[PDB]
Amino acid sequence: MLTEFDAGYGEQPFRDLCANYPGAEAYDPHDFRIEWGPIFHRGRLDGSARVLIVGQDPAQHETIVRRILVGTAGRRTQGFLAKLGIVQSYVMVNTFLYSVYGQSGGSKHKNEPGIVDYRNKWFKAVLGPGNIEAVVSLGGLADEAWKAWLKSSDGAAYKTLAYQHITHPTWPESSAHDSATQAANTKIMLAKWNAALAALAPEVKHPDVPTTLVPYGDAFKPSELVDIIAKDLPAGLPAWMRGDTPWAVRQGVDAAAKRRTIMITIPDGVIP
Amino acid sequence: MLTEFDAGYGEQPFRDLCANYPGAEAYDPHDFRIEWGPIFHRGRLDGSARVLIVGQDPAQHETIVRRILVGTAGRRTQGFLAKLGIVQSYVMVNTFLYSVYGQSGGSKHKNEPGIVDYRNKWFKAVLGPGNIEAVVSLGGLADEAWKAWLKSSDGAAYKTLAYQHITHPTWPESSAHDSATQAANTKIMLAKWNAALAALAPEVKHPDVPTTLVPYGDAFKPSELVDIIAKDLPAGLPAWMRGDTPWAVRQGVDAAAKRRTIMITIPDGVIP
Numbered sequence: 001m002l003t004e005f006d007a008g009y010g011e012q013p014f015r016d017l018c019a020n021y022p023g024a025e026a027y028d029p030h031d032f033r034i035e036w037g038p039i040f041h042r043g044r045l046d047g048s049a050r051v052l053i054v055g056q057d058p059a060q061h062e063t064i065v066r067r068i069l070v071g072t073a074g075r076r077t078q079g080f081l082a083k084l085g086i087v088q089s090y091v092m093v094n095t096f097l098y099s100v101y102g103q104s105g106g107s108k109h110k111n112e113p114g115i116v117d118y119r120n121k122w123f124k125a126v127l128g129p130g131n132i133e134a135v136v137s138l139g140g141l142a143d144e145a146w147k148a149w150l151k152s153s154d155g156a157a158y159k160t161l162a163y164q165h166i167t168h169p170t171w172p173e174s175s176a177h178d179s180a181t182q183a184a185n186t187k188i189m190l191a192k193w194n195a196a197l198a199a200l201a202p203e204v205k206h207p208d209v210p211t212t213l214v215p216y217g218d219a220f221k222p223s224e225l226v227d228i229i230a231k232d233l234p235a236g237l238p239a240w241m242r243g244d245t246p247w248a249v250r251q252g253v254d255a256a257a258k259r260r261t262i263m264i265t266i267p268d269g270v271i272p
Numbered sequence: 273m274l275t276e277f278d279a280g281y282g283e284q285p286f287r288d289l290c291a292n293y294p295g296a297e298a299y300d301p302h303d304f305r306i307e308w309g310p311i312f313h314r315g316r317l318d319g320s321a322r323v324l325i326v327g328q329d330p331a332q333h334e335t336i337v338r339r340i341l342v343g344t345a346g347r348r349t350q351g352f353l354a355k356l357g358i359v360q361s362y363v364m365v366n367t368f369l370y371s372v373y374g375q376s377g378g379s380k381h382k383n384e385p386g387i388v389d390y391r392n393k394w395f396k397a398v399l400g401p402g403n404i405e406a407v408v409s410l411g412g413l414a415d416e417a418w419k420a421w422l423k424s425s426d427g428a429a430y431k432t433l434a435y436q437h438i439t440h441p442t443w444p445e446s447s448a449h450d451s452a453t454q455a456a457n458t459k460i461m462l463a464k465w466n467a468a469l470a471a472l473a474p475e476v477k478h479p480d481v482p483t484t485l486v487p488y489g490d491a492f493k494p495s496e497l498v499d500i501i502a503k504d505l506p507a508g509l510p511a512w513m514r515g516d517t518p519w520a521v522r523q524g525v526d527a528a529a530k531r532r533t534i535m536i537t538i539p540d541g542v543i544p
């Protein structure tokens with residue numbers, strides 16, 4: 001009928017934010033992939049947001065879509081929020097603007113003023129209206145990011161919020177090699193996720209659709225992997241860039257080659 | 273004082289346009305690369321527009337920047353407009369939303385009833401404010417596109433509008449293989465261009481900068497290759513995305529793979 005899209009960052013305070021973002025003076029160019037520029041958010045900036053997701057750092061798919069959480073992690077997160085009856089009314093700022101280069105990480109820089117101060121201005125901007133009913137952090141650094149926000153002047157008012165530390169969507173796969181232990185560490189992730197949902201269900205009193213909580217099983221049921229909605233992607237992008245199939249990856253013979261190149265690859269079935 | 277960027281298409285009437293665009297029902301999926309989405313424009317949509325550029329079709333350098341004419345062609349067009357003394361005050365629009373898949377030139381469909389009307393839907397919108405001081409078409413289908421606009425109801429008001437059809441900026445390289453023949457067709461494009469500049473310059477009464485008209489020589493002065501300005505690119509996009517060096521190309525072993533894939537590689541010098 002009509003196809004929805006995220007107009008982007010026209011309205012203040014987001015215009016100045018996207019107009020005045022930090023570079024090498026804050027993010028170390030070797031430890032952070034600043035070469036790809038910053039990806040700022042995913043979701044609503046009009047106030048209709050009820051849940052805030054605090055993620056960790058972008059990847060190759062985010063680098064093309066220019067929105068965060070549009071890969072596997074985001075697709076698992078979508079379903080997580082889908083269980084809360086939340087289908088679009090969300091906001092998702094990543095901790096770090098740029099991706100960590102290695103597991104060396106931003107954790108070497110998690111308390112750097114350049115990173116924290118800027119991130120907090122975004123926190124303040126999305127929470128200002130005060131329509132956020134819950135907060136869900138993805139992983140450890142997201143947690144300390146949310147905590148570091150709360151110990152600040154502007155953050156103190158949000159200590160009563162419904163924050164919830166969550167394990168990082170892809171811990172299973174980055175923690176493990178065999179697929180047995182990965183599934184084993186998937187079962188433990190879903191368990192902790194269920195705990196968080198049980199904790200958050202009562203506090204989200206404005207869902208997009210009223211839905212009674214259906215807990216995760218031992219593994220990811222496909223119904224619980226929801227494609228990113230069109231309203232999240234900028235004008236024109238194709239629906240294969242928000243689908244169930246991977247379409248972006250870094251390529252190179254050595255670590256240097258991989259850092260400079262990305263390959264976009266359209267899934268089979270789009271072209272006749 | 274910092275970097276700029278294109279908010280996107282959030283103010284009407286452009287958002288509804290970007291929300292209701294034509295797809296396979298208008299652009300033939302075999303002849304057009306509908307697979308990458310439509311790219312809508314480049315430049316100003318706030319009324320500051322002075323020149324309308326009607327280009328032909330997007331390329332790889334337009335599938336990423338999401339803006340049209342951001343490669344060699346755009347950089348030549350950029351240099352062209354600099355001579356009219358306008359450095360930002362422009363609007364750029366293509367004949368086709370999607371790129372042509374082949375050498376034919378997507379002419380077989382140059383008269384569709386879904387392709388043409390939409391292009392005109394944009395024309396009416398960009399001309400609506402009535403501050404457009406000049407029109408420049410790039411190549412044959414660009415030329416025929418402007419004429420097709422003029423033969424319509426809403427277009428009738430613009431037959432008096434200063435218009436110059438010029439050779440498509442990449443005519444030299446798409447014609448021949450030898451450096452010499454490309455070198456031979458060097459002033460044949462400029463000289464023909466100089467006339468259009470001579471013809472429009474007096475009618476471009478509101479430039480961004482008072483500028484002395486300098487006709488083209490026989491070849492492209494490096495100064496006549498102007499990098500695309502930041503305000504044209506969406507928020508966050510790295511400045512290597514709009515530099516003097518190419519950074520995107522199609523790759524594959526057969527024709528099918530090549531249509532599905534795109535390699536982006538960052539130029540040397542971005543990463544220390």
Ligand SMILES: O=c1cc[nH]c(=O)[nH]1
Nearest residue numbers: 055056057058069073
């Ligand atoms: O943006 C992203 C992408 C993957 N994982 C995250 O935590 N954030």
Ligand SMILES: O=c1cc[nH]c(=O)[nH]1
Nearest residue numbers: 327328329330340341
């Ligand atoms: O946008 C573009 C890019 C290349 N050539 C064109 O005609 N238009």
